[PDB]
RNA sequence: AUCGCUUCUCGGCCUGGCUAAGAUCAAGUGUAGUAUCUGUUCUUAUCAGUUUAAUAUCUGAUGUCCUCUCGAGGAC
């Protein structure tokens, strides 16, 4: 395996938040309930941070609270 | 066999990582003439003048005498 060397860290870092968030997901969700979209949650994760980076108020207006 | 729930098959119907938003930029005439957008456009009455292939344009009065209170009646 490839090291982590200057120029990889930061979008490794990235790949790394990515997958923690993934298993956030896994088990967070009940019994049931077929569509996981988690895909759905990264793309609101990339839209958070960059309202973060933008200073814009990100607030999806119903969205569950965990 | 009707009704409600659960499960599955089939038919039209929402659905692409990260970085410094990754970074940066972006030049023509002049004179005539034509065409297309957009706006303004066209109902008052016959006749006469001008005009015209003809229309259009174009300048002039748009039922008279008497009486009563744009209206009515009388030999008309």
Redesign the pocket.
């Known amino acids: 395996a490839k090291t982590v060397t200057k120029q990889r860290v930061?979008?490794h870092?990235?790949?790394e938040l990515?997958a923690a968030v993934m298993h956030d997901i896994l088990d967070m969700m009940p019994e049931?309930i077929?569509?996981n979209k988690a895909?759905?949650i990264?793309?609101h994760?990339?839209e958070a941070?960059?309202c973060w980076?933008?200073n814009i108020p990100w607030k999806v207006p119903g969205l569950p609270t965990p």
């Open positions: 930061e979008s870092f990235d790949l990515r049931g077929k569509q895909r759905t990264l793309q994760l990339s941070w960059r980076k933008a």
